Amino acid sequence: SDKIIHLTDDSFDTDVLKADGAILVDFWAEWCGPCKMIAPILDEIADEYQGKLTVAKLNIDQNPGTAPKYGIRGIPTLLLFKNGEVAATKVGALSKGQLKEFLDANLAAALVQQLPKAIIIGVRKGGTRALLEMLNLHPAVVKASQEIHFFDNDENYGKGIEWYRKKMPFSYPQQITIEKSPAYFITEEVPERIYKMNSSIKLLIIVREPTTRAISDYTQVLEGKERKNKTYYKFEKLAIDPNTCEVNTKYKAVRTSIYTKHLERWLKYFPIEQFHVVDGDRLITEPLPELQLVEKFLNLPPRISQYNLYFNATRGFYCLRFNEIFNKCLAGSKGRIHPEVDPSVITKLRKFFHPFNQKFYQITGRTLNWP
Ligand SMILES: O=C(O)[C@H]1O[C@@H](O)[C@H](O)[C@@H](O)[C@@H]1O[C@H]1O[C@H](COS(=O)(=O)O)[C@@H](O[C@@H]2O[C@H](C(=O)O)[C@@H](O[C@H]3O[C@H](COS(=O)(=O)O)[C@@H](O[C@@H]4O[C@H](C(=O)O)[C@@H](O[C@H]5O[C@H](COS(=O)(=O)O)[C@@H](O)[C@H](O)[C@H]5NS(=O)(=O)O)[C@H](O)[C@H]4O)[C@H](O)[C@H]3NS(=O)(=O)O)[C@H](O)[C@H]2O)[C@H](O)[C@H]1NS(=O)(=O)O
Ligand SMILES: Nc1ncnc2c1ncn2[C@@H]1O[C@H](COP(=O)(O)O)[C@@H](OP(=O)(O)O)[C@H]1O
């Protein structure tokens, strides 16, 4: 649960000089009395300043090379670095008020609404909400908690990019905003609009087994009709053409699962390097490895840990653990009791997707091992 980076001489360059934004470094030693008194104050500050400041320590007895390069002749010393250059210093023991006065006087943390620098564009039912919720565990990530539907709605898109920006949450300059809008993946007119706004934007795609995703899709549409006391057909009657007895390519649930078909459209405007495909099947069984890849994709330091995720045998999925008294599980619409589909139909669907799946692996570079 520790939020303080433990530094060494060998790690100082990568963790401090090559870090983005603001880092406060405490130079300390076991023999330094005031260092010990101030140590818990830094723990409080690391929580209160999450998103604007990272806190780090270097033990100068164990790592004696770094302090002489900064002329440090007494400890505790607090050095505030920004982008590899010393920004401010404080010498000696100080109280919380002096430190907060020092930090507030030295950090340019204009809380601002910024346009997203990463967008979860799909795919619906692949775990888009879950992915967004998990990425928000990173101190530098700030989520747009509602779908805004900007690029897929001519009405909203007419209001201009500024309207979109002012629909984003407040964040600090050094924070990265992430939006989730599954419909963007399928809406045919959306890649050009996003490309125009920011051609270097990063795009996130979350997928799970094609056939499974279609059944999850069907279940939601079914629940929506049963809620309103309406009628609906069985999955089989919709996914299989009655006449030919083949897969019904006109059914949206099936078309949406042909991930490759949609990706081709997006690739006409963005290079594959700007995309990262998250394995939704692995996100359910073992999230952390998939989330750690997203961290590197976003140029974010490793900060999501195994402590943040815990298995809830009751709900049957993983839930989020932020601090010691803030837990959050996903809503009831996440984790629906799927209907049993005739094994024969499932086999036909699996074979149908197979060639599209192999193309997807080849284009994206990630083999997801789907049946
Ligand atoms: O098909 C027909 O018959 C249509 O025919 C036409 O000719 C007629 O004219 C129409 O009248 C007929 O309408 C029906 O069919 C259309 C088309 O469907 S389509 O073919 O699939 O396209 C239906 O319209 C579509 O309905 C979709 C749907 O999924 O129902 C829409 O999908 C998008 O939007 C939904 C709804 O979002 S929202 O309103 O909530 O904003 C998304 O599903 C919800 O996702 C949110 C989410 O943000 O994750 C969930 O919110 C939960 O979680 C929140 C956060 O919690 S936590 O952090 O996880 O812990 C929490 O704050 C919420 O409280 C919580 N909700 S909860 O209920 O309390 O649990 C919701 O749970 C999800 O339901 C969906 O992901 C999104 N997908 S997208 O499209 O890919 O973007 C779609 O936009 C829309 O066009 C029409 O409804 C239908 N009418 S009928 O059923 O009456 O027949
Ligand atoms: N920790 C988690 N808790 C609940 N559902 C999760 C989850 N991680 C992934 N999911 C999955 O994400 C799906 C919904 O994705 P989306 O938010 O894009 O609609 C769920 O569909 P099911 O209801 O079919 O299980 C479920 O499989």
CA 205 – ligand 1 centroid, Å? 19
Strand partners, 119: 179, 203
Three-state secondary structure call for residue 247: strand
Nearest to 120 by CA among 194, 206, 191: 206
> What is the rounded distance in angstroms from the CA atom of residue 74 to the CA atom of residue 358?
62
Three-state secondary structure call for residue 233: coil
- 234 phi and psi angles, rounded to 5 deg: -70, 155
Final residue of a structural domain among 89, 105, 121 = 105
CA 129 – ligand 2 centroid, Å? 8
Strand partners, 205: 122, 277
Closest atom of ligand 1 to 149 CA is 82
Return the residue matching tokens 């999450």. Answer: 50
**Are both 88 and 127 inside the same structural domain?**
no
Nearest CA to ligand 1 atom 16: 221
Q: What is the 3-state secondary structure (H, E, C) of 4-60?
A: EEEECCCCHHHHHHCCCCEEEEEEECCCCHHHHHHHHHHHHHHHHCCCCCEEEEEEC
Return the residue matching tokens 């880092």. Answer: 23
Q: What is the CATH number of the domain that holds 15?
A: 3.40.30.10
**Are both 206 and 297 inside the same structural domain?**
yes
**Are both 213 and 345 inside the same structural domain?**
yes
32 as an active site residue: the answer is yes
Domain assignment present for residue 369? The answer is no
| N-terminal to C-terminal alpha carbon distance within the chain | 39
In whole angstroms, how far apart are CA 342 and each of 19, 91, 235?
54, 73, 10
Final residue of a structural domain among 105, 128, 153 = 105
Query: Are 37 and 7 a contacting pair, CB within 8 Å?
Result: no
> What is the rounded distance in angstroms from the CA atom of residue 46 to the CA atom of residue 103?
12
228 lines ligand 1 (CB under 6 A): yes
**Are both 56 and 126 inside the same structural domain?**
no
Ligand of minimum distance to the alpha carbon of 338: 2
Q: What is the CATH number of the domain that holds 148?
A: 3.40.50.300
Final residue of a structural domain among 69, 87, 105 = 105
Nearest CA to ligand 1 atom 31: 183
**Are both 354 and 313 inside the same structural domain?**
yes
Residue 301, C-beta contacts closer than 8 angstroms, at least 6 positions apart: 15, 19, 295
Residue 277, C-beta contacts closer than 8 angstroms, at least 6 positions apart: 205, 206, 207, 364, 366
152 lines ligand 1 (CB under 6 A): no
> What is the rounded distance in angstroms from the CA atom of residue 77 to the CA atom of residue 98?
14
In whole angstroms, how far apart are CA 142 and each of 40, 91, 114, 121?
27, 34, 10, 16
Range of the domain at 39: 4-105
**Are both 121 and 251 inside the same structural domain?**
yes
Please tell me the total count of domains within the chain.
Answer: 2
CA 221 – ligand 1 centroid, Å? 8
**Are both 84 and 128 inside the same structural domain?**
no
Domain assignment present for residue 371? The answer is no
Three-state secondary structure call for residue 275: strand
**Are both 76 and 208 inside the same structural domain?**
no
Domain assignment present for residue 38? The answer is yes
**Are both 147 and 30 inside the same structural domain?**
no
**Are both 90 and 196 inside the same structural domain?**
no
Strand partners, 311: 318
221 lines ligand 1 (CB under 6 A): yes
Nearest CA to ligand 1 atom 65: 331
- 314 phi and psi angles, rounded to 5 deg: -60, -60
> What is the rounded distance in angstroms from the CA atom of residue 143 to the CA atom of residue 165?
13
> What is the rounded distance in angstroms from the CA atom of residue 135 to the CA atom of residue 141?
7
Query: Are 210 and 173 a contacting pair, CB within 8 Å?
Result: no
Three-state secondary structure call for residue 84: coil
Query: Are 174 and 50 a contacting pair, CB within 8 Å?
Result: no
**Are both 147 and 253 inside the same structural domain?**
yes
Three-state secondary structure call for residue 3: coil
Strand partners, 247: 240
- 129 phi and psi angles, rounded to 5 deg: -65, -50
CB-neighbour burial class of residue 197 (10 A; exposed 0-12, middle 13-18, buried 19+): middle
Task: Quote the longest CA-to-CA distance of the chain.
Answer: 86
Which pairs count as long-range contacts for 244-251, CB under 8 Å and 24+ apart, including other chains? 246/348, 247/348, 247/349, 247/352
**Are both 46 and 143 inside the same structural domain?**
no
Cα 251 to its chain centre, rounded Å, is 31
Write the Ramachandran bin of 348: left for phi over 0, alpha for psi from -120 to 50, otherwise beta: alpha
Query: Are 177 and 144 a contacting pair, CB within 8 Å?
Result: yes
329 as an active site residue: the answer is no
Cα 70 to its chain centre, rounded Å, is 36
Query: What H or E segment, with its residue span, contains residue 320?
Result: strand 317-321
Nearest to 305 by CA among 117, 139, 163: 139
CA 124 – ligand 1 centroid, Å? 10
